[PDB]
Amino acid sequence: HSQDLENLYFQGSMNIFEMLRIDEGLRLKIYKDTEGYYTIGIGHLLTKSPSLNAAKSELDKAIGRNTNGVITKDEAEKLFNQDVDAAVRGILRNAKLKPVYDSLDAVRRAALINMVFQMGETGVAGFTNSLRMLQQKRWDEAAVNLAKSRWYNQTPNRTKRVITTFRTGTWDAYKNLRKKLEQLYNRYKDPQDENKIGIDGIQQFCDDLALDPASISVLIIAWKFRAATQCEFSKQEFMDGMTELGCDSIEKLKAQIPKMEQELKEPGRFKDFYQFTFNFAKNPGQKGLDLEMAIAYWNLVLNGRFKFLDLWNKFLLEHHKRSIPKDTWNLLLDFSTMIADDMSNYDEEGAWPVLIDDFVEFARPQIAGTKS
């Protein structure tokens, strides 16, 4: 087959795919990008359609099988290599980029392609002076001039690595990044399971970040790392998270925490965070969330946001053991958003969970007492 990766085995193991895996990140399941569009792999836009089935249909045509929205790393590289070919065709019909591209060695060509993926042909073509320095093999001067640009300020860690690639003509920046992340992961990994960071590693991680291990900030970090379950932190989660956050050090991650917290000021983002917490807290072997665990996480994430949280606690602590389903968890936030200060606007026909119907009835003695 034309796209077989065996046809690339004559190349080095380091390549443009592995470069953008480090600089942009790799997703093996369909997700929505910043614009809300279905994407997979390394930034491969599937469709602008709002239908996930439409996105899966396009993915099946491109991959050649019924993937149901999930692909392998090798499949993502085949998809990416097609995108690279198209990007190179565009570079070669661009009067401003073809001369420099033709002049560059293979490693520096990858660096230019990297730039084109990030900012497009028109963006890269604007670097007139730096492109001329590259075409004249004035590597150090090109590196200095590129560092003065807004590009550098937008994505400093990625831009530093691309500049180093232009400066040296080697993969050193990417070898060094990989080793930095591996050595940082090794500080936290479970000595009995190399594939995850265990309870002790998470504690050390929190200590290195100067965080109280019971603070909401830890859960916010888990959310940004898309962690699947509490008390575990997989190697893929750690690497994907550090990549997406643009951090190759604890110091850089520490500086990112306030930006994660600020993202929650948007109700849409807090909703995403709140709903994430359910799947994160639930035992993977269970379908629902144990009531005691639900209470613990509700108190963490809703304190100061849900005006009836204290009454909710009293209500639940008198109830029998139950498993909280995802729909009940999600609708509690909707209830908190709409409910009047005295619950006078509750709509009993609104198809709320029975748990919330019962709660409104239970809060009646308290509500009347405060009014008297």
Ligand X SMILES: CCN1C(=O)[C@@H](NC(=O)c2cccc(C(F)(F)F)c2)[C@@H](c2ccc(F)cc2)c2c(CN)nn(-c3ccccc3)c21
Residue ranges that bind ligand X, judged by CB under 6 A: 199, 202-203, 205-206, 213-215, 218-219, 221-222, 225, 227, 230-231, 233, 296-297, 300
Q: Which of 24, 121, 263, 357 is catalytic?
A: 24
* Complex with ligand X: residue 63 or 222, whichever CB lies closer: 222
Amino acid at 144: V
Nearest distance from C-beta of residue 290 to ligand X, angstroms: 12
Choice between 8 and 216, CB closer to ligand X:
216
Q: How far is CA 196 from CA 111, 221, 226, in A?
A: 32, 16, 14
24 catalytically annotated: yes
In the set 4, 18, 23, 33, the catalytic residue is: 33
Is residue 251 annotated as part of the catalytic site, yes or no?
no
Burial class (CB in 10 A: 0-12, 13-18, 19+), 96: middle
Shortest spacing between CB 234 and ligand X, in angstroms: 8
Question: Which residue lies nearer to ligand X by CB, 82 or 229?
Answer: 229
Tokens of 121: 């042909």
Least CB distance to ligand X at residue 98 (A): 45
The number of beta carbons lying within 10 Å of the beta carbon of residue 308 is 20
Q: How far is the CB of 46 from ligand X (least distance, A)?
A: 29
Measured between alpha carbons, how far is residue 167 from residues 65, 104, 124, 151, 288 in Å?
42, 12, 17, 16, 54
Residue 97 or residue 245: which is nearer to ligand X going by CB?
245
Nearest-approach distance from CB 236 to ligand X, in angstroms: 12
Q: Specify the residue, 138 or 226, whose C-beta has the smaller distance to ligand X.
A: 226
Residues with catalytic roles: 24, 33
